[PDB]
Curated annotation (Swiss-Prot), chain C:
GO cellular component annotations of the record: mitochondrial inner membrane; mitochondrion; proton-transporting ATP synthase complex
Protein name per the record: ATP synthase F(1) complex subunit gamma, mitochondrial
Protein source organism: Bos taurus (Bovine)
Gene: ATP5F1C
GO biological processes: proton motive force-driven ATP synthesis; proton motive force-driven mitochondrial ATP synthesis
UniProt-annotated location(s): Mitochondrion inner membrane
Modified residues (N6-succinyllysine): K24, K73, K102
Similarity field: Belongs to the ATPase gamma chain family.
Disulfide bridges in this chain: none
Organismal lineage: Eukaryota, Metazoa, Chordata, Craniata, Vertebrata
Primary localization class, coarse: mitochondrion
UniProtKB/Swiss-Prot annotation, chain D:
Tree of life domain: Eukaryota
Gene: ATP5F1B
Residues bearing PTM N6-acetyllysine: K58, K112, K117, K154
Organism: Bos taurus (Bovine)
Disulphide bond pairs: none
Its biological purpose: Catalytic subunit beta, of the mitochondrial membrane ATP synthase complex (F(1)F(0) ATP synthase or Complex V) that produces ATP from ADP in the presence of a proton gradient across the membrane which is generated by electron transport complexes of the respiratory chain. ATP synthase complex consist of a soluble F(1) head domain - the catalytic core - and a membrane F(1) domain - the membrane proton channel. These two domains are linked by a central stalk rotating inside the F(1) region and a stationary peripheral stalk.
Residues the record lists as Phosphoserine modifications: S47, S65
Protein name: ATP synthase F(1) complex catalytic subunit beta, mitochondrial
Positions where N6-succinyllysine occurs in the chain: K154
Self-association state and partner proteins as the record states: Homotrimer. Component of the ATP synthase complex composed at least of ATP5F1A/subunit alpha, ATP5F1B/subunit beta, ATP5MC1/subunit c (homooctomer), MT-ATP6/subunit a, MT-ATP8/subunit 8, ATP5ME/subunit e, ATP5MF/subunit f, ATP5MG/subunit g, ATP5MK/subunit k, ATP5MJ/subunit j, ATP5F1C/subunit gamma, ATP5F1D/subunit delta, ATP5F1E/subunit epsilon, ATP5PF/subunit F6, ATP5PB/subunit b, ATP5PD/subunit d, ATP5PO/subunit OSCP.
Entry's localization field: Mitochondrion inner membrane
Protein family membership: Belongs to the ATPase alpha/beta chains family.
UniProtKB/Swiss-Prot annotation, chain E:
The gene coding this protein: ATP5F1D
Residues annotated with N6-acetyllysine modification: K97, K126
Gene Ontology molecular function, alphabetical: proton transmembrane transporter activity; proton-transporting ATP synthase activity, rotational mechanism; structural molecule activity
UniProt GO BP: aerobic respiration; mitochondrial proton-transporting ATP synthase complex assembly; proton motive force-driven ATP synthesis; proton motive force-driven mitochondrial ATP synthesis; proton transmembrane transport
Task of the protein: Subunit delta, of the mitochondrial membrane ATP synthase complex (F(1)F(0) ATP synthase or Complex V) that produces ATP from ADP in the presence of a proton gradient across the membrane which is generated by electron transport complexes of the respiratory chain. ATP synthase complex consist of a soluble F(1) head domain - the catalytic core - and a membrane F(1) domain - the membrane proton channel. These two domains are linked by a central stalk rotating inside the F(1) region and a stationary peripheral stalk.
Record family assignment: Belongs to the ATPase epsilon chain family.
Lineage: Eukaryota, Metazoa, Chordata, Craniata, Vertebrata
Major site of localization recorded for this protein: mitochondrion
Protein name: ATP synthase F(1) complex subunit delta, mitochondrial
GO CC annotation terms, alphabetical: mitochondrial envelope; mitochondrial inner membrane; mitochondrion; proton-transporting ATP synthase complex
UniProt subcellular location: Mitochondrion; Mitochondrion inner membrane
N6-succinyllysine modifications at: K97, K126
Curated annotation (Swiss-Prot), chain G:
Organism of provenance: Bos taurus (Bovine)
Protein name: ATP synthase F(1) complex catalytic subunit beta, mitochondrial
Keyword Zinc: no
Cellular component annotations (GO), alphabetically ordered: mitochondrial inner membrane; mitochondrion; proton-transporting ATP synthase complex
Phosphoserine: modified positions: S47, S65
A GO molecular function held by the record: ATP hydrolysis activity
Lineage: Eukaryota, Metazoa, Chordata, Craniata, Vertebrata
Positions of post-translational N6-succinyllysine modification: K154
Gene Ontology BP terms: proton motive force-driven ATP synthesis; proton motive force-driven mitochondrial ATP synthesis
């Protein structure tokens, strides 16, 4: 509910605005941000089959997109980011994923841990 | 060197002022060319 | 699929057929006064004889804008006049700009347009062929001969 | 369809919803160029109300015709008068949207009730061009016109 | 003979025509370009001595003039006009407005813009 | 019958050209006359509900469009212009409407008399 | 239509032909965006196969979405990014064509039977952009990707 609270409506407006400005005209910073955000949220919601994800692992990967860490990266590398990010949190941070599974929420402690993890992870990917 | 230079102005500026002086001094009838030509249609953009 | 969908498509394309018909008519009008001012400026330009690209603001004219944009990145990778020059070629070479220009192509391009370009301190342009086709001594005396002939080469690329 | 077609005549006011509008996130997905009422008259609701309601319908109806033309031929072929009415129309579409209290579980936004006085003033100002400087998405999914101004500053960072 | 050319952005006057002599102004004096001559303009008169009798008179504001190894010339003018289409009464009034705006303005860049216009308009009344 | 035949023809000239009214800009004076005049005449066909007019009131309003006294007026302000103009000519010039109904046409006397009432009201209204 | 519509369910692979594709000269006139198989699976066919198949269907579907704009104005009015996908997609569409042994009388060309290794490899090279410089009709009615280079050299 936290990470995908206003995601359903925002993605509907993204497809409206993206389809509207197909022509290569100049636009303000607020609408190009919506396009920049909406493209990379769509790449997160891509998913293969015969491997369904647990609620906490879904919450982890949606965090990166919705809180804005993916915005500067290229659209084509978002699926690569997600796989590397998901396998990393499965490896080391089982306490954090476990704490979201036990509680059923993102605490301000867990928010601060994810904030530290994704920012340091992003700097590695961008280089 | 030149009174028009020193201050900073180039020959293309010298040419634009001289050419405007000729078009400004006409007998009405032939200003149809001078209104169409010699326009400032270009806009300056910079980042 | 639906009758409501197909009736909407006919409603729009009927207007576009009339608008496209109108725009070739307006293009033919501007083509007339562009041709009649060509041969006076052509002998002037040929008699006269940093990457600059020349086209216009207005689109919907085939690959006039993209042709000059293709040869700029060619000259840039080895080693702009028009709003469509920026929209296409800018974000890729954003740190390689001196000046960019707007409000061109609509009205006839004058000599005063070439001066304003030169004042702000090879050249790429589309040379005309036919209705269908196109194709992409003292020390200080030479100083002023350079700057006026520079405005003539920029003016030659504008009229073509 | 015979069922809804027959129902219209039995009604004093009609609120026609569209899948096309809901598809774009615009909730409530009311068709502004299809919903009607008997009381929409300058003698009943006053001329200031009436003249704004028709002004909203005009700018939306004029925009509806353009949409299909400017999807192919591009935005830059429009007049400066037209692309003014295009930008205003798109903001007006978004300011017709509203987060309901009963729909809080779908939107993710707090429910808002907008009084009739602040509704008319909101669409008055957008018609006149008082928020042409402000961006597009600030009008989407907010209660009164004041929230658009506040949300516009929030989208700066 | 000489392959003489003389044109402007708007209009063209001559194009490889057989002319005897063409006097043209410049920044330093005024060269008379005869057919025999060795390998920058100023506001002044362009006198064109034709092959037979008559001598027409033009005026040129600014630009450049070329003299090649072979007998060929192309005089380039931004605004070339004849004495038939030049007003004397307005040229005096333009010279007053220029000299007016000289005695007042103090900016170092602007005085150049005024003093060029004084020179250009003073070249018109010399002819007119 | 005098003003209707003239109006009908000019609207036909408009309706062909009107599809590229907005998409034109660099248009010649022939089509710009038809596009201007046609938008003016269309606005005169607009009318309020529950206020049906007498024939002499209609022809005066159409005549203003046909002879082209409203050609420079802003197209958006024609419906409001007409509503005030109608109240003015009914209130003050009640004898003028008597002439049009009696004579069975807009005579040369009425032409000149109505010409003064339009051109003065036009400059006063648009300010 | 009820007859074909019901038949889909009773199948493991569907090769859907097209008149639109047939009229443009592409034979066999298969729709690459309307034909499916239940073994199109990276576990069955291998991950290299699957990626090259879905990559071809992506660039074909991207080209299909532009067809309203290309029909009116043309290929020249698109952006440089959009024209590059169109040029590859059209080269793919023609490389999807092939001369059949049973249809030698109709075509004129000799019949070809391309092995699975060179089928993947050919479309894999085209997606990467190793033949953006080559023309379109060089890919029309050829067996392996080698014949597309050989056909292009004779033209120049
Ligand atoms: Cl009211
Ligand atoms: Na095949």
């Amino acid at each position: 509910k936290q990470v995908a609270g206003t995601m359903k409506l925002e993605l509907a407006q993204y497809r409206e605005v993206a389809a509207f400005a197909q022509f290569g005209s100049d636009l303000d910073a607020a609408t190009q941000q919506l396009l920049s955000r909406g493209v990379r949220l769509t790449e997160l919601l891509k998913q293969g089959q015969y491997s369904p994800m647990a609620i906490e692992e879904q919450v982890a990967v949606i965090y990166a997109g919705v809180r804005g860490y993916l915005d500067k990266l290229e659209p084509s590398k978002i699926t690569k980011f997600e796989n590397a990010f998901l396998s990393h949190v499965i490896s080391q941070h089982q306490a954090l994923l476990g704490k979201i599974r036990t509680d059923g929420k993102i605490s301000e402690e867990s928010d601060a841990k994810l904030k530290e993890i994704v920012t340091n992870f992003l700097a590695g990917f961008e280089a | 060197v030149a009174y028009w230079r020193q201050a900073g102005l180039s020959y293309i500026r010298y040419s634009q002022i001289c050419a405007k002086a000729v078009r400004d001094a006409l007998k009405t009838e032939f200003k149809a060319n001078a209104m169409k030509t010699s326009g400032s249609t270009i806009k300056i953009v910079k980042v | 699929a639906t009758l409501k969908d197909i009736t909407r498509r006919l409603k729009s394309i009927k207007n576009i057929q009339k608008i496209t018909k109108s725009m070739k008519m307006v293009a033919a009008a501007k083509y007339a006064r562009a041709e009649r001012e060509l041969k006076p400026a052509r002998v002037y330009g040929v008699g006269s004889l940093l990457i600059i690209g020349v086209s216009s603001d207005r689109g919907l004219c085939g690959a006039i804008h993209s042709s000059v944009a293709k040869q700029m990145k060619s000259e840039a990778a080895n080693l702009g006049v028009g709003d469509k020059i920026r929209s296409i070629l800018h974000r890729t070479h954003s740190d390689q700009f001196l000046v960019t220009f707007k409000e061109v192509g609509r009205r006839p391009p004058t000599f005063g347009d070439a001066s304003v370009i030169a004042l702000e301190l090879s050249i790429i342009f589309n040379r005309f062929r036919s209705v269908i086709s196109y194709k992409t001594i003292d020390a200080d005396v030479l100083r002023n001969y350079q700057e006026y002939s520079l405005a003539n080469i920029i003016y030659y690329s504008l009229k073509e | 369809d015979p069922a809804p077609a027959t129902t219209f005549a039995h009604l004093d006011a009609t609120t026609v919803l569209s899948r096309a509008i809901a598809e774009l996130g615009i909730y409530p997905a009311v068709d502004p160029l299809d919903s009607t009422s008997r009381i929409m008259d300058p003698n009943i609701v006053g001329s200031e109300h009436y003249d704004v309601a028709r002004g909203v319908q005009k700018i939306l109806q004029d925009y509806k015709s353009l949409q299909d033309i400017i999807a192919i031929l591009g935005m830059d072929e429009l007049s400066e008068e037209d692309k003014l009415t295009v930008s205003r129309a798109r903001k007006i579409q978004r300011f017709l949207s509203q987060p309901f209290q009963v729909a809080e579980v779908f939107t993710g936004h707090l429910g808002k009730l907008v009084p009739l006085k602040e509704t008319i003033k909101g669409f008055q100002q957008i018609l006149a061009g008082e928020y042409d400087h402000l961006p597009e998405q600030a009008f989407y999914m907010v209660g009164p016109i004041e929230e658009a101004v506040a949300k516009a500053d929030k989208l700066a960072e | 003979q000489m392959s003489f050319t003389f044109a402007s952005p708007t209009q063209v006057f001559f194009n490889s025509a057989n002319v005897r002599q063409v006097d043209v102004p410049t920044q330093t004096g005024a060269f008379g370009i005869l057919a025999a001559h060795v390998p920058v303009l100023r506001p002044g008169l362009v006198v064109v001595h034709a092959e037979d009798g008559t001598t027409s008179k033009y005026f040129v504001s600014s630009g450049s003039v070329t003299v090649n190894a072979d007998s060929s010339v192309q005089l380039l003018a931004e605004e070339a006009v004849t004495l038939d289409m030049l007003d004397l009464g307005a040229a005096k009034a333009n010279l007053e407005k220029a000299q007016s705006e000289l005695l007042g303005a103090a900016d170092e860049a602007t005085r150049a813009e005024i003093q060029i216009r004084i020179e250009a308009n003073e070249a018109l009344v010399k002819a007119l």
